[PDB]
């Protein structure tokens, strides 16, 4: 491994061997069907709202999120990088597809598959990933740096459906070597969204953009139809000329064939035929190839950039709505712009590398923080692009100034912006893309007073319930199977209109977004103020016994739905107290004295009653009326956690909060599998896990990271990082369960999981306040 010195991979990059087998992998722990795409994953490519492409550590383009809201795991075997190498003096060279595997069926059988084990490494520190290729049969060593321009405070490049592959080649031997690098890509128009004739009309063309000191050669893979539909658009691959390399290409090879039409050319001398052919296909799958070839002398290094783009302008949801994706603002809407996107990338990628370095450097240069924490912090951000992200630039048909945004809870529970989950999981957005965050909260503000009196069947018990009640904040902003943004509360497993936690969380999210963007945006507080007042007022009506706190009813009425709360709970109670104190402060800022005095009076009566009902000398009781009332809940003081972030001071005494957190560490962390798997939700005071519900026996990964940040702000540094380490270990480490780039909601003590690719563990960014 001499190639690693010639590139700059950071020490905190997650690492694994190409073709490595992982034996300890976790699986779903529920009865009902659930996504398990295996441990063969990698860092995604593509911007926010663009659709994403997961290229795995084995090299394959396998996890397809190009249909917005859907997860489709299947390797498109034609999509590869391949290498030819020939030492001078030798009669024949050697060709190899850089993929640790082979096709299932007989297509592309002529290609050299099965990249051998122990001959290269994969590295990832999102948005960057790397592959090194160190093979005894290949005297020249190769490496590639791949990424998309995911850049905080940038809402432009961050939206781009593009990826750059920056190759580096070095000759450590004492002989000249001829080398070629080839990018192949299938014309994937019709991969999704086309009901019949899936390849019909697909055709490939070659663009040669000649100019002074900048030759670009690219394949544009599109369709002869100009229909403005979900399925129609273009893919493009290409490369930029550099000193010392020649470019060659093949416009059309058959992907539904043995591939020797391409491979007989490449395997001979690493040079393609330069055959243009715009003939449309009927049933055969087609693809394009772009190759560079060059001669490396002993000790010579050379660098060459390839790129990939996809112009698929329209996203369609199952309810019928068609929207334009965000990137169309900068490239157009007609779906004929893939070359323009590719060109932009090939000419500006170095500026993008530096911009990515600029935002990662403040954390990476901090030597007080361990590498493992940095690994988790950056790589958890994968989900912002991979979470079925929807970011609209006009409805098809239809002008407006705001661009609506949605991030899925996950793919098993296909709900956009689930409010509970984004309470924990929206920290990266508020901290790194605050204009998206504020847009999402305005979307919620506009739904507060929506009344939908039509009745739906509740999934858990079969009872009938009203869809959306006036003054109650929605559970979610729709599903990709139906109508995101337009039809809210797609969730039907419980009735969220009776929930005691969502209205409080909403108000806390509003004040968080004011506080964490500099306490400057009065216009935002102005816009949300009436919804905030309405949210707290409706929740006050649920106070039955008149202690100033809404009563949990012993039935599903908060996010830990099946782990039943009754009376005053520590969870909803603390959130209620924090929400009231946040609303006081908004009242002061907007000079709404009536509201200030009201929410101040409610706060004082509730604070007093919360402490009297729940404080037990060591921690705060789960609730006042359940059979598991004295359980130690990991999330018991969630309101105080947010109160620290929002700079609202003490809602509860400092001494009591410190004892409560120490107890959670002593029990929920350290007595659950030696503190190596995070904080289990519920533990009994005797030291055994609360078995009253499945949710109590689960570690929730986002809750554990949030708890770690709470510990961190309260000076409990060892406890914070030790608590968070178990989540890192399980996700990323060789002794974990193989959840890298699909961090789940939860696992049980055996390490098996519920709901991979989950939003909540983005809460790790709460540790960077
Ligand atoms: Ca009450």
Numbering used by the authors: 31 to 428, 431 to 801
Please share text taken word for word from the publication where this structure appeared.
Although no X-ray crystal structure of human GBA2 is available, structures have been solved for Thermoanaerobacterium xylanolyticumTxGH116 β-glucosidase, which shares 37% amino acid sequence identity with human GBA2.8 Instead of hydrolyzing glucosylceramide like GBA2, TxGH116 exhibits high activity toward 4-nitrophenyl β-D-glucopyranoside (4NPGlc), and β-1,3- and β-1,4-linked glucooligosaccharides. The TxGH116 structure contains an N-terminal domain, formed by a two-sheet β-sandwich, tightly associated with a C-terminal (α/α)6 solenoid domain that contains the catalytic nucleophile, E441, and general acid/base, D593, residues, which were verified by chemical rescue of alanine mutants. GH116 enzymes are retaining GHs, as shown for Saccharolobus solfataricus SSO1353 β-glucosidase/β-xylosidase, human GBA2, and TxGH116.6,8,12 In the retaining mechanism, catalysis involves two carboxylic acid/carboxylate side chains with one serving as an acid/base and the other as a nucleophile. Here, we report the structures of Thermoanaerobacterium xylanolyticum β-glucosidase (TxGH116) D593N acid/base mutant in complexes with cellobiose and laminaribiose and its catalytic mechanism.
Previous work showed that the TxGH116 D593A greatly reduces enzyme activity, suggesting that D593 is the catalytic acid/base. The decreased activities were verified by kinetic analysis of D593A and D593N, which showed ∼30 000-fold decreases in the apparent kcat/Km values relative to wild-type. In all structures, the acid/base residue was mutated to asparagine (D593N) or alanine (D593A). The D593A and D593N unliganded enzymes and D593N complexes crystallized in the space group P21212, isomorphous, with wild-type TxGH116 crystals, whereas the crystals of TxGH116 D593A in complex with cellobiose and laminaribiose crystallized in the P212121 space group and had 2 molecules in one asymmetric unit. The overall structures of unliganded TxGH116 D593A and D593N, and in particular the position of amino acid residues in the active sites, were similar. However, the loops of residues 523–534 and 583–597, the last containing the mutated acid/base residue, as well as the side chains of D452 and Q727 in the active site differed from those of wild-type TxGH116. The different positions of these residues may optimize the hydrogen-bond interactions in the active sites of the acid/base mutants and reflect the flexibility of the 583–597 loop, which was shown to adopt distinct conformations in structures of wild-type TxGH116 solved in different space groups.
